[PDB]
Amino acid sequence: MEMEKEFEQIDKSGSWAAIYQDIRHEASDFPSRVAKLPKNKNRNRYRDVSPFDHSRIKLHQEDNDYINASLIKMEEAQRSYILTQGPLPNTVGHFWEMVWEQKSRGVVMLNRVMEKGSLKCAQYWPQKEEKEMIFEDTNLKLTLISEDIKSYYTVRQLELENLTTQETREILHFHYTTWPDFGVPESPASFLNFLFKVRESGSLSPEHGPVVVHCSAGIGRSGTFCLADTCLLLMDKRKDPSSVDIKKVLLEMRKFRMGLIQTADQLRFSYLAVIEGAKFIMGD
């Protein structure tokens, strides 16, 4: 069922809240024992958001390998993503260890450091070229090289150096700065633009590690980003683009991380973004 019609149907019926609840109900449930251990309580930002044990990312170190991060592996679309929470004070060092060890090229950021008057993640990159950041627990150095600021998003070039071996890599930081404090954007135009800029960079391509994407919890806006990407990629690849069922993709992704897509407004916005994106993917 062409999602564009399915859309007008739900919209006129005002059924979005029931569709979304159908997904909550059918969504997988798997253990999260490692995340609930007591030594990891201060590695989790929210008590109700944990990664499944079967898909969690592990840090390469014997001490404690835990981080609140999941690998979503979309097998038909040939895309991989790592979804993680905005880093905490005591986990910024683990975050950049993750980026190193998985050979990622891009970081994608969908939230501001402060929203609604509270802190939604730590200031985990450097803001001035001459003031670099050092992470002593994981022996890494991080430096700002350039910065390109636009109306709807900002792109930064950073240099991550492994102090133990002195290798260095170039990481790209894609920071979407204008998602409203409440609800969702009225148009997907700028969110879709942001995506194509991430695509154009190479950061989603298989010659690199998986991309790291995050918001505050790593399930809401982060969910919207990679559901849209995958869905548009599938419309390119199939004989019949109208066979792409967005609810089925979401449910497949939710086998890898709980909670993806947090409200019914987001679900709707996701549909909207794919429909407009399609009107480039299918030649226009």
From Swiss-Prot:
Subunit structure: Interacts with EPHA3 (phosphorylated); dephosphorylates EPHA3 and may regulate its trafficking and function. Interacts with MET. Interacts with NCK1.
Organism whose genome encodes this protein: Homo sapiens (Human)
Sites of N-acetylmethionine modification: M1
Modified residues (Phosphotyrosine): Y20, Y66
UniProt modified residues of type S-nitrosocysteine: C215
GO CC aspect terms: cytoplasm; cytoplasmic side of endoplasmic reticulum membrane; cytosol; early endosome; endoplasmic reticulum; endosome lumen; glutamatergic synapse; mitochondrial crista
Signal peptide: none
Tissue: Expressed in keratinocytes (at protein level).
Modified-residue entries (Phosphoserine), positions: S50, S242, S243
GO MF annotation list: cadherin binding; enzyme binding; ephrin receptor binding; insulin receptor binding; non-membrane spanning protein tyrosine phosphatase activity; protein kinase binding; protein phosphatase 2A binding; protein tyrosine phosphatase activity
GO BP, sorted A to Z: actin cytoskeleton organization; cellular response to angiotensin; cellular response to fibroblast growth factor stimulus; cellular response to hypoxia; cellular response to nerve growth factor stimulus; cellular response to nitric oxide; cellular response to platelet-derived growth factor stimulus; cellular response to unfolded protein
Residues with PTM Cysteine sulfinic acid (-SO2H): C215
Cysteine sulfenic acid (-SOH): residues carrying this PTM: C215
Major site of localization recorded for this protein: endoplasmic reticulum
This protein's name: Tyrosine-protein phosphatase non-receptor type 1
Site of covalent link N,N-(cysteine-1,S-diyl)serine (Cys-Ser): C215-S216
Enzyme Commission (EC) number: 3.1.3.48
Gene that produces this protein: PTPN1
Residues forming the catalytic site: C215
Residues where Cysteine persulfide is found: C215
Function, as annotated: Tyrosine-protein phosphatase which acts as a regulator of endoplasmic reticulum unfolded protein response. Mediates dephosphorylation of EIF2AK3/PERK; inactivating the protein kinase activity of EIF2AK3/PERK. May play an important role in CKII- and p60c-src-induced signal transduction cascades. May regulate the EFNA5-EPHA3 signaling pathway which modulates cell reorganization and cell-cell repulsion. May also regulate the hepatocyte growth factor receptor signaling pathway through dephosphorylation of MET.
Keyword Nucleotidyltransferase applies: no
UniProt entry keywords in alphabetical sequence: Acetylation, Endoplasmic reticulum, Hydrolase, Membrane, Oxidation, Phosphoprotein, Protein phosphatase, S-nitrosylation
Keyword Transferase: no
